[PDB]
Design a protein around this ligand. Structure first.
Ligand SMILES: CC(C)(C)C[C@@H](CO)Nc1ncnc2[nH]ccc12
Ligand SMILES: [Cl-]
Length: 167
Protein backbone atom coordinates (compact mmCIF):
# COMPACT_ATOMS: atom_id res chain seq x y z
CA UNK A 1 0.00 0.00 0.00
CA UNK A 2 1.19 3.51 -0.91
CA UNK A 3 -0.19 7.05 -0.76
CA UNK A 4 -0.86 7.63 -4.48
CA UNK A 5 -4.54 8.58 -4.86
CA UNK A 6 -7.02 8.83 -7.71
CA UNK A 7 -5.05 6.81 -10.28
CA UNK A 8 -6.59 4.57 -12.92
CA UNK A 9 -4.94 1.13 -13.03
CA UNK A 10 -3.76 0.26 -16.55
CA UNK A 11 -1.88 -2.99 -15.80
CA UNK A 12 -0.47 -4.97 -12.89
CA UNK A 13 2.22 -2.29 -12.37
CA UNK A 14 1.29 0.88 -14.35
CA UNK A 15 -1.13 3.54 -13.10
CA UNK A 16 -2.18 6.84 -14.74
CA UNK A 17 -3.78 10.15 -13.71
CA UNK A 18 -4.47 13.62 -15.14
CA UNK A 19 -2.26 15.68 -12.83
CA UNK A 20 0.49 18.28 -12.53
CA UNK A 21 3.59 16.29 -11.57
CA UNK A 22 4.89 19.21 -9.48
CA UNK A 23 1.74 19.33 -7.36
CA UNK A 24 1.62 15.53 -7.20
CA UNK A 25 5.22 15.40 -5.98
CA UNK A 26 4.59 18.12 -3.40
CA UNK A 27 1.59 16.19 -2.03
CA UNK A 28 2.98 12.65 -2.07
CA UNK A 29 6.71 13.27 -1.47
CA UNK A 30 7.51 10.02 -3.31
CA UNK A 31 10.78 8.17 -2.94
CA UNK A 32 11.50 8.86 -6.63
CA UNK A 33 10.20 11.54 -9.00
CA UNK A 34 11.32 11.18 -12.64
CA UNK A 35 12.45 14.27 -14.55
CA UNK A 36 12.20 14.50 -18.34
CA UNK A 37 15.84 15.58 -18.63
CA UNK A 38 18.20 16.40 -21.46
CA UNK A 39 21.84 15.27 -21.58
CA UNK A 40 23.08 18.64 -20.25
CA UNK A 41 20.61 18.68 -17.34
CA UNK A 42 19.51 22.15 -18.50
CA UNK A 43 16.03 22.35 -16.99
CA UNK A 44 14.47 25.07 -19.10
CA UNK A 45 10.95 24.00 -19.99
CA UNK A 46 8.33 21.30 -19.94
CA UNK A 47 8.42 19.00 -16.93
CA UNK A 48 12.08 19.80 -16.24
CA UNK A 49 11.56 23.55 -16.14
CA UNK A 50 8.54 23.06 -13.88
CA UNK A 51 10.29 20.72 -11.43
CA UNK A 52 13.32 23.01 -11.29
CA UNK A 53 11.19 26.12 -10.70
CA UNK A 54 9.46 24.33 -7.81
CA UNK A 55 12.90 23.74 -6.20
CA UNK A 56 13.73 27.46 -6.43
CA UNK A 57 16.54 26.56 -8.91
CA UNK A 58 18.30 24.22 -6.45
CA UNK A 59 17.85 21.35 -8.94
CA UNK A 60 19.70 23.39 -11.60
CA UNK A 61 22.55 24.30 -9.20
CA UNK A 62 23.02 20.65 -8.24
CA UNK A 63 22.77 19.59 -11.90
CA UNK A 64 25.44 22.07 -13.03
CA UNK A 65 27.89 20.61 -10.51
CA UNK A 66 27.00 17.07 -11.67
CA UNK A 67 27.75 17.97 -15.32
CA UNK A 68 30.96 19.81 -14.42
CA UNK A 69 32.20 16.62 -12.73
CA UNK A 70 30.77 13.90 -14.97
CA UNK A 71 29.98 15.38 -18.37
CA UNK A 72 26.70 14.94 -20.22
CA UNK A 73 24.37 11.98 -19.94
CA UNK A 74 23.62 9.65 -22.85
CA UNK A 75 20.30 9.77 -24.68
CA UNK A 76 18.49 6.84 -23.10
CA UNK A 77 20.50 7.24 -19.89
CA UNK A 78 19.85 8.58 -16.42
CA UNK A 79 21.33 9.74 -13.15
CA UNK A 80 20.01 9.88 -9.58
CA UNK A 81 20.21 13.25 -7.83
CA UNK A 82 18.39 14.88 -4.93
CA UNK A 83 14.62 15.26 -4.98
CA UNK A 84 14.97 18.55 -3.04
CA UNK A 85 11.57 19.61 -1.61
CA UNK A 86 9.65 17.35 -4.04
CA UNK A 87 10.82 13.78 -3.37
CA UNK A 88 13.65 11.88 -1.73
CA UNK A 89 15.40 11.41 -5.09
CA UNK A 90 14.99 12.67 -8.63
CA UNK A 91 15.77 10.20 -11.41
CA UNK A 92 16.76 12.38 -14.37
CA UNK A 93 15.97 10.32 -17.48
CA UNK A 94 16.83 11.39 -21.03
CA UNK A 95 14.32 10.24 -23.60
CA UNK A 96 14.98 10.92 -27.28
CA UNK A 97 13.97 14.40 -28.45
CA UNK A 98 12.36 13.98 -31.88
CA UNK A 99 12.72 17.74 -32.38
CA UNK A 100 16.50 17.12 -32.31
CA UNK A 101 16.33 14.14 -34.69
CA UNK A 102 17.04 11.48 -32.04
CA UNK A 103 16.25 7.79 -32.48
CA UNK A 104 12.81 6.94 -31.08
CA UNK A 105 14.08 3.38 -30.50
CA UNK A 106 16.02 4.88 -27.58
CA UNK A 107 12.72 5.40 -25.76
CA UNK A 108 12.74 1.79 -24.58
CA UNK A 109 16.28 2.20 -23.21
CA UNK A 110 15.13 5.34 -21.39
CA UNK A 111 12.24 3.51 -19.70
CA UNK A 112 14.55 0.65 -18.65
CA UNK A 113 16.06 3.05 -16.09
CA UNK A 114 12.76 2.93 -14.19
CA UNK A 115 13.33 -0.76 -13.41
CA UNK A 116 16.09 0.16 -10.96
CA UNK A 117 13.44 1.66 -8.63
CA UNK A 118 10.60 -0.19 -6.95
CA UNK A 119 8.10 2.72 -7.15
CA UNK A 120 8.22 5.96 -9.16
CA UNK A 121 6.16 9.05 -9.96
CA UNK A 122 6.86 9.88 -13.59
CA UNK A 123 5.82 11.76 -16.73
CA UNK A 124 5.52 10.16 -20.15
CA UNK A 125 9.04 10.17 -21.55
CA UNK A 126 9.69 11.95 -24.86
CA UNK A 127 6.16 13.45 -24.81
CA UNK A 128 5.37 17.15 -24.70
CA UNK A 129 8.16 19.36 -26.04
CA UNK A 130 10.31 16.28 -26.76
CA UNK A 131 8.09 15.69 -29.78
CA UNK A 132 7.11 12.01 -29.58
CA UNK A 133 3.61 10.55 -29.78
CA UNK A 134 2.35 10.19 -26.17
CA UNK A 135 0.24 7.15 -27.10
CA UNK A 136 3.44 5.45 -28.23
CA UNK A 137 5.29 6.53 -25.09
CA UNK A 138 2.59 4.98 -22.89
CA UNK A 139 2.80 1.72 -24.87
CA UNK A 140 6.59 1.55 -24.47
CA UNK A 141 6.23 2.31 -20.76
CA UNK A 142 3.74 -0.53 -20.23
CA UNK A 143 5.86 -2.97 -22.25
CA UNK A 144 9.20 -2.02 -20.61
CA UNK A 145 8.68 -0.97 -16.98
CA UNK A 146 8.14 -3.85 -14.56
CA UNK A 147 8.31 -1.82 -11.33
CA UNK A 148 5.39 0.24 -10.03
CA UNK A 149 5.00 3.45 -12.01
CA UNK A 150 2.51 6.26 -11.36
CA UNK A 151 2.18 8.37 -14.52
CA UNK A 152 1.11 12.02 -14.28
CA UNK A 153 -0.32 13.43 -17.53
CA UNK A 154 -0.62 17.22 -17.41
CA UNK A 155 -3.07 17.67 -20.31
CA UNK A 156 -6.64 16.55 -19.54
CA UNK A 157 -7.57 16.14 -23.20
CA UNK A 158 -4.51 13.96 -23.84
CA UNK A 159 -5.17 11.93 -20.68
CA UNK A 160 -8.65 11.07 -21.96
CA UNK A 161 -7.23 10.03 -25.35
CA UNK A 162 -4.56 7.86 -23.70
CA UNK A 163 -7.15 6.09 -21.54
CA UNK A 164 -9.74 5.64 -24.30
CA UNK A 165 -7.15 4.33 -26.78
CA UNK A 166 -5.27 2.09 -24.33
CA UNK A 167 -5.12 -1.53 -25.41
C1 LIG B 1 1.31 16.91 -22.97
C2 LIG B 1 2.03 16.88 -21.61
C3 LIG B 1 1.99 18.31 -21.01
C4 LIG B 1 1.33 15.93 -20.63
C5 LIG B 1 3.50 16.37 -21.86
C6 LIG B 1 4.40 15.96 -20.62
C7 LIG B 1 5.78 15.40 -21.12
O1 LIG B 1 6.40 14.61 -20.14
N1 LIG B 1 4.64 17.09 -19.67
C8 LIG B 1 4.24 17.19 -18.32
N2 LIG B 1 3.63 16.10 -17.72
C9 LIG B 1 3.23 16.15 -16.40
N3 LIG B 1 3.36 17.19 -15.56
C10 LIG B 1 3.97 18.27 -16.14
N4 LIG B 1 4.23 19.43 -15.53
C11 LIG B 1 4.84 20.33 -16.35
C12 LIG B 1 5.00 19.71 -17.59
C13 LIG B 1 4.44 18.37 -17.50
CL1 LIG C 1 6.34 19.00 -21.81
Amino acid sequence: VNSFSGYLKLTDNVYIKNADIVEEAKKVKPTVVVNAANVYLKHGGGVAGALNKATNNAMQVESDDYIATNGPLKVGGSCVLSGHNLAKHCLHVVGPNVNKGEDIQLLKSAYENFNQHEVLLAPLLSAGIFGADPIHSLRVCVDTVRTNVYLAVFDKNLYDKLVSSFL
